[PDB]
Design a protein around this ligand. Structure first.
Ligand SMILES: Nc1ncnc2c1ncn2[C@@H]1O[C@H](COP(=O)(O)OP(=O)(O)O)[C@@H](O)[C@H]1O
Ligand SMILES: [Mg+2]
Lengths: 464, 51, 49, 592, 593, 226
């Protein structure tokens, strides 16, 4: 049946290297290493008995520069013992991972057993063959109008959630997980916290438990107290689990990677620990590739019924799109959901500013077959009129309300009744995409039929 | 006098609003961007000197 | 939402001077609008009389 | 053992140091200067000495302590004054008889000559002992009695011998524990690595509030025992008042005040004011210093001491949390700490990240703030302490766009926002209600529904009143004030009354020194009832000017609600507030 | 065969390897990872491998091929997808039965099992043959018929034996050349080093326009067949969709869509949609995919392979140019190629230069963009192909001051800059009409005079209207609309109409997916005529508000001209536009009267 | 500072160190740091300029057992007339006040060209008291600052809304500003003005205002000194 067992029944001795040439920052350098690998995750034993894992990063002749995830602190040349496993970091995966809470490095903190591995998969993964990919054309009804109508999330989409520090991005992401469902017919959530607060992790865990998603969710929690070097591997572990459960098990998976800003801060700390290129704002020049190896593990593949949707939750430092984390994440991912501090202060939930938001995979996955015919034109017209509303609001602020034209007044009314009634939703209110489109048509019927220039004439005649 | 004064007041209030809502925010944004780019140049020089 | 300024120390100083002058002008013009509005209220009261 | 090889400024390279750990403190030089190991290259071990490095010659022995930067945890931590390294400033002054700090002075961080009364705990000989278990109690002060002696969190095993009751100096054996060899002998103290957070069994949710006493702070922007706040902490903003209130009038059973790089005369002021404090926890007035530990740290101290000051303070707070005591930590000059961290990073040559700050500043800040929180302490008996961090940001350059200020604002759940202009306007505690916020209201709703059910909606309506009054003030600046409607006029008048009475709390005054939570709730009830009565009178059609003329007595009573003295407390003040509500309703209805 | 001395990131310093030339292809490791030698520090030779370096051990053998990174040119590639080192992704998928690319798989770049119908050329036995001469042709597919088999450059001599007409694989001999007494055997394919550009007889001045189909790109900022192009802009601006629409609807005979640092779902979208799309060329409906090959290198693929993908794509474009086909290579992101270059340079330890990008980045970009150009192929018979390079630079932070963007603008001739303020609010194409420019208008004046004489004057009028209304928009945002004159109001209204209807072109609607050259010309004529009629009516004295109220129908008819189906044919739609203009003139005359 | 420490602490006398050109001192720090292999910090100055300036400044201060004090007047030289420069930023961080010399005042021949709007002493409330100085010092200084700010505002306002349209509190404030800059701030280089004489001059300046207008001064002091 399965021949992967035969290679498993092999014992490989590991060399214990007491020869530690030196240590600096998070990098511990070994000497007299016999044929070092390039990513051999080692088991570095401290003088006090603590065992920290580390993986080599640069291997000159008879030398290996190990970085330890838990930190060098306490490492001594005379007493530390480093054993080379001989293979890269491999997460023990199985179908029983669903319903278990793991630490940052995959060690189970659910007070339960060690995961009874069905396979050992490298956390770094491999690029999915573009010929083997399938373009995601199956719309997900997230239940929130700002994401279903204005934007649109497919099944294989990797649309993240751009947000600031204090915004309710966590409540939006938990809303999406508790409401995600195919428009025209469950999601095994894989949640990866990186440097989140205890309050955030507790909120996510309690939300999953109360909504019943905990029976099909595998948390990889890396709190702020957890070491800042294993934030690099936590999304890799969670995404390897998601890739398993999706491709090799045929389960649709929501991957929620919280605090990708914290992941990128860990990446910048690791890079600055070395003599890496500073990129922009101190982040490594390889940041794009690293974030690519994170995000691009999503998508569907040919012949396998599983799929992975990645909803990374970013934390923009100054609510700036131009910052490297949001810029690189927008360049890689297939859209973004822009949570706005302006709308949050205005009191709107969800505080989604749809103008910076986008979804590449709306183009296909919305249309006549997936949903009703008018959706694309309605979304385009809504974007145009929302922008006209914001511009007319700025013009009103500058030059008073009297100078505005009839079009500007209509657009201000549309802006008010669009932010107040369309974007705004309850935390537990889910709207069918057709209901959202009907509300959108009410908002467009605010206007006369002539000003809806982005609507095709046939759609406008059939839907006005 | 009433008509001229009302016109001048409307112009002055318009210019106050224009300043506070365009010129001050545009200049503040330009200041922030120039400061960020200067910090970027300083960081690049620091990395080159470190090399 | 910004000005096409070449990032330089001299340009930074010029933009700080522009911001200071704009803030001073904004305060001056707001106070002038307040004074002119007081005069305008007096004018309209005299118009009614 | 070790020997000096190279000295170029603070960085020192010591050869023959095989076996030296990372971040381990070593006694550098013949004067035993303290410094940590930055990096190791074979035998060599790069050391950044803390004190001034002038005079260290090649060949000076470098003794290796064997332990990282550690806090000296035990009895006698309470009313002493420390630095970042945890060096007793008072004991150093007494020993050296000099106003300066002699270079490489190694006075014990805890008083060894003092005798502590030790009462053995429930654990007996032959009983299993685990980390964090209370195996005794020590009477330290009057405010802090039964200073629970804790087994070190890492240590465990079977008890071999426990000392009986009596008086024992902190340095003598108190307990012996055999764990695969009876190599453990425990005194009244233990050393805990500073960077390593003290473990807990479980970290509960921060539910109970931190009643600081100031009406605005404990009503509109409340903090919870185990919560992390932030304060602008600039000069002339009421930071002194906020620190004094949180020190003496709060729920905390202990206080850890860290300076981490404050100015010399500011440190002189705080170390001269805090010994002059007195908290009436018991019937007789007793000093707040009996429960407040200072980490006094000026700018002349080593940059390593300034960078480790907040870590030492949070470790002390963690220790007093492991004893079941609610601890509040006031981290003044957090930015100063960030500047010290940046200076250390520059000495390392580590790459800058933002505005020159190191790459790991955000991670360090997040970890340090996450170390704060309510938690059930390790080991038996079960006791749940809490650490509250109130870190005054004190932004560098007077801007909130700094990396450290941005990280602190993002991580901390409460911002109290002292206003320089409002403080200059002769207002206390000068809280800017427009920018201050607290994210602990959602978790405090449980305690409020348990104790004062209407308090959340009352504070929400008060915030709505204040915001509407700000909008109405903008409108009245834009156009004529008389054009405002009767409802707008009532909003403005009631919000001005709220600002004058509810918000402006005089710390020096005896009646408003510490307004309890019940009195704050009753005042909120009275003000909201007055606003509702005025709104009902307006809806009835009565002129607002006539209504105010008739209800000036009710307005005077609402203002005097400040002047009701919390000294009687309990039902006496509450009963008087119930009577005030009856008068307000009757007078308002009579005017109709 | 040398060993491995260091493996740090994507670079592998290989010891005991004396004799390896620079940019020589090597096989690093036991899995035979393809790599290129950068430095030669004595015995050591730093190697940038084009695969993942995980699992490499010190001591693993490194074989020296003795050849540079060589693309494989011939029948086969036309309709395929590659992997930068030119590994066919379809063949990889079939051979591995897995959705991942195996490390160090060595599948042939061109399928050898397929037999191609070869028709010998005009060259016969004994006739002298030179480099780039066409000695035959094969039937690649329905669209690329007579895929002319070129004798490799740098090869000359006398034809001793030429294969007759029939079906041949790529391994079979096709032609034999004797040179200086040495026989050389030539097949249907031949390898060419990607770094060295393919020789041409003489590069010519490009004079025919590259019809992108986008209205703004075709009219305002035109590009020629053989001209370099740049599309800077932040994420979501529309550079990828512009590139895909250009590949779908361009008049170029061959498309080389290169994906460097671009998400793999875009490659999947191309592979799924292009077969569905059909090209009206060749006299029959043939799928677009029959004339499009993809050099796909997803962002998560090896870093060093982005440069290989760029060079492979441009060399395929140069080969199809040497065959005489007007090709247009499309780099997904030269900025991602530059980021890969920066990563390799930082791994090496070189001086960061500007923003960390290596000091040779400008020179590398200049060479790559100078690969493009209309040129006469190297050998007889005479033919004139071209290669357009439409490379989408993606600046970091959305700022056009990035080093890669500045170097790209220094080397290129067309700037299709993208504004994110227009990317939002769904105003695609988001071409920033202000900063955007095209230096090919002067050379395209000849084509415009030949086909559409009024095209340059209408385009200049549109540019003037847009610039004047931008100035008036600044004025109105500063001091309101009360000060503006009537003609200012018409200028603002007409420019808003142009931006909303003409410039704004939805690439995913049936009507505006492809606005041809004649439809774009008719739409400029309609909009410019509307502006002129409104100006004349207002100068006659009619109030602009009343004129707009009366001619709202004409304005809506003009704005709705973008809905006219290009599928209806040039004759039918042009009649509709003529009727629209006539009715517009009648309505304006009636309103004025 | 070693001489100051000696005198003040082992002799019990007050010192008042007056350092000059701490910008030059920071340039010397730069030269010394780059003599080693230290990479320049934010503006070329070493990353430990904060530590060095902190040592030099906080060498001063009062002490417990010794009846002596050290005061510091570091006297910077702002390079481009900006506070964002590292030397002024760090000096403001460590030190406990600012005294600003203004080019606008210097170009008008006003010596010393000190403008009192950006200048403040954070520890003024301790120094200016009743046992020290005279009991009206703090209120007089606050009133002078408020009226000088009003004078600057009115000077800017006059060229906008005419001299006549200014209020009485603006015209009298303009007169106060003129007398303040030209007689109070303007001090002879060799003119020794004790604190009492300076306060008497300040009261002479304030007396142009009727007693009702001086609001920042306490009623008792206003009734006694006016
Ligand atoms: N001409 C167009 N017509 C319709 N939609 C477009 C057009 N150009 C871009 N878009 C939209 O812009 C979105 C972002 O894609 P794009 O910006 O091209 O990727 P990139 O960020 O690589 O430039 C797509 O979802 C697409 O729907
Ligand atoms: Mg793209």
């Amino acid at each position: 049946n399965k021949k992967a067992v035969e290679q498993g029944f092999n014992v490989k001795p590991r060399l214990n290297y007491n020869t530690v040439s030196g240590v600096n920052g998070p990098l511990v350098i070994l000497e007299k290493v016999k044929f070092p690998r390039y990513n051999e995750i080692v088991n570095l034993t401290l003088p006090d008995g603590t065992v920290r894992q580390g993986q080599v990063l640069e291997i000159r002749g008879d030398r290996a520069i190990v970085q330890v995830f838990e930190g060098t602190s306490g490492i001594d040349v005379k007493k530390t013992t480093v054993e080379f496993t001989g293979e890269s970091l491999r997460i023990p995966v199985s179908e029983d991972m669903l319903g278990r809470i793991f630490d940052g490095s995959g060690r189970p903190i659910d007070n339960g057993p060690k995961v009874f591995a069905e396979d050992y998969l490298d956390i770094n993964g491999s690029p999915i063959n573009p010929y083997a990919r399938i373009y995601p054309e199956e719309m997900i009804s997230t239940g929130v109008s700002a994401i279903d109508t204005m934007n649109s999330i497919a099944r294989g989409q990797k649309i993240p959630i751009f947000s600031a520090s204090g915004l309710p991005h966590n409540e939006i992401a938990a809303q999406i997980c508790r409401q995600a469902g195919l428009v025209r017919p469950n999601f095994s959530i894989v949640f990866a916290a990186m440097g989140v607060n205890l309050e955030t992790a507790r909120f996510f865990k309690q939300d999953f438990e109360e909504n019943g998603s905990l029976e099909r969710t595998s948390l990889f929690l890396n709190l702020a107290n957890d070491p800042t070097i294993e934030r690099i591997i936590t999304p890799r572990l969670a995404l390897t689990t998601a890739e398993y459960l999706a491709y090799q098990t045929e389960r649709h998976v929501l991957t929620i990677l919280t605090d990708m800003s914290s992941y990128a801060d860990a990446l910048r700390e690791v890079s600055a620990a070395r003599e890496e290129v500073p990129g922009r704002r101190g982040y490594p020049g390889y940041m794009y590739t690293d974030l690519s190896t994170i995000y691009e593990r999503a998508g569907r593949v040919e012949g396998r019924n599983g799929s992975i949707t990645q909803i990374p939750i970013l934390t923009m430092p100054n609510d700036d799109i131009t910052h490297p984390i949001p810029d690189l994440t927008g360049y890689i991912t297939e859209g973004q959901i822009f949570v706005d501090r302006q709308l949050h202060n205005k009191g709107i939930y969800p505080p989604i500013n749809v103008l910076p938001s986008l979804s590449r995979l709306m183009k296909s996955a919305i249309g006549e077959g997936m949903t009703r015919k008018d959706h694309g034109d309605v979304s385009n017209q809504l974007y145009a009129k929302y922008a006209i509303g914001k511009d007319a609001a700025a013009m009103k602020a500058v030059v008073g309300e009297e100078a505005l034209s009839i079009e500007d007044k209509l657009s201000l009314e549309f802006l008010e009744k669009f932010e107040k009634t369309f974007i705004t939703q309850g935390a537990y209110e889910d709207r069918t995409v057709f209901e959202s489109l009907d509300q959108a048509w009410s908002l467009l019927r605010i206007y006369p039929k002539e000003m809806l220039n982005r609507i095709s004439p046939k759609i406008l005649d059939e839907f006005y | 006098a009433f008509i001229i004064l009302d016109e001048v007041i409307k112009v002055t209030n318009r210019r106050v609003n224009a300043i506070e809502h365009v010129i001050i925010p545009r200049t503040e944004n330009t200041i922030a961007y120039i400061n960020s780019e200067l910090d970027e140049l300083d960081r690049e020089e620091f990395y080159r000197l470190k090399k | 939402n910004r000005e096409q300024v070449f990032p330089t120390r001299m340009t930074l100083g010029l933009m700080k001077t522009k911001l200071k002058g704009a803030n001073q002008g904004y305060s001056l013009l707001k106070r002038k609008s307040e004074a002119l509005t007081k005069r305008f209220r007096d004018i309209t009261k005299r118009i009614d009389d | 053992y070790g020997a000096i090889y190279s000295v170029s400024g603070p960085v020192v390279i010591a050869e023959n140091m095989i076996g030296c750990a990372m971040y381990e403190l070593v006694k550098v030089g013949h004067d035993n200067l303290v410094g940590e190991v930055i990096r190791i290259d074979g035998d060599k071990a790069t050391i950044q000495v803390y004190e001034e490095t002038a005079g260290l010659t090649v060949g000076d022995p470098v003794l290796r302590t064997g332990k990282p930067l550690s806090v000296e945890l035990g009895p006698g931590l309470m009313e002493t004054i420390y630095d970042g390294i945890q060096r007793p400033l008072k004991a150093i002054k007494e020993e050296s008889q000099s106003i300066y700090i002699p270079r490489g002075i190694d006075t014990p961080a805890l008083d060894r000559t003092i005798k502590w009364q030790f009462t053995p705990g429930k654990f007996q000989v032959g009983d299993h002992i685990s980390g964090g278990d209370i195996y005794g109690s020590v009477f330290e002060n009057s405010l802090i009695s039964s200073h629970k002696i804790l087994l070190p969190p890492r240590s465990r095993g079977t008890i071999t011998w426990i000392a009986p009751a009596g008086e024992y100096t902190l340095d003598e054996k108190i307990l012996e524990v055999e764990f695969d060899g009876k190599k453990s002998d425990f005194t009244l103290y233990h050393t805990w690595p500073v960077r390593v957070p003290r473990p807990v069994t479980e970290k509960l949710s921060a539910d109970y509030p931190l009643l600081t006493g100031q009406r605005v702070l404990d009503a509109l922007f409340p903090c919870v025992q185990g919560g992390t706040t932030c304060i602008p902490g600039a000069f002339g903003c009421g930071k002194t008042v906020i620190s004094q209130s949180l020190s003496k009038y709060s729920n905390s059973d202990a206080i850890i005040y860290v300076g981490c790089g404050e100015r010399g005369n500011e440190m002189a002021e705080v170390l001269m004011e805090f010994p002059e404090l007195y908290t009436e926890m018991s019937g007789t007035k007793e000093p707040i210093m009996k429960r407040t530990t200072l980490v006094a740290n000026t700018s002349n101290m080593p940059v390593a001491a300034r960078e480790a000051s907040i870590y030492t303070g949070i470790t002390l707070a963690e220790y007093f949390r492991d004893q079941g005591k609610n601890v509040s930590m006031i981290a003044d000059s957090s930015s100063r700490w960030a500047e010290a961290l940046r200076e250390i990073s520059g000495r390392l040559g580590e790459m800058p990240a933002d505005q020159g700050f190191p790459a790991y500043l955000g991670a360090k800040l997040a970890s340090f703030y996450e170390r704060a929180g309510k938690a059930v302490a390790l080991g038996s008996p079960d006791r749940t302490g809490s650490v509250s961090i109130v870190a005054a940001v004190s932004p560098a350059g007077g801007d909130f766009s700094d990396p450290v200020t941005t990280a602190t604002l993002g991580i901390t759940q409460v911002f109290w926002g002292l206003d320089k202009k409002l403080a200059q306007r002769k207002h206390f505690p000068s809280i800017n209600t427009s920018v201050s916020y607290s994210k602990y209201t959602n978790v405090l709703n449980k305690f409020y529904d348990s104790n004062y059910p209407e308090f959340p909606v009352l504070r929400d309506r008060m915030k709505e009143i204040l915001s509407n009054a700000e909008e109405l003030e903008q409108v009245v600046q834009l156009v004529g004030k008389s054009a405002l409607s009767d409802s707008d006029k009532i909003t403005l008048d009631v919000a001005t009354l709220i600002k004058e009475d509810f918000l402006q709390q005089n710390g020096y005054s005896t009646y408003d020194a510490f307004c309890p939570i019940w009195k704050t709730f009753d005042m909120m009830r009275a003000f909201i009832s007055y606003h509702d009565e005025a709104q009902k009178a307006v809806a009835n059609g009565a002129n607002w000017s006539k209504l105010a003329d008739s209800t000036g007595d009710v307005k005077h009573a609402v203002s005097s609600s400040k002047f009701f003295e919390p000294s009687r407390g309990e039902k006496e003040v509450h009963g008087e507030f119930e009577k005030l509500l009856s008068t307000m309703q009757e007078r308002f209805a009579e005017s109709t």
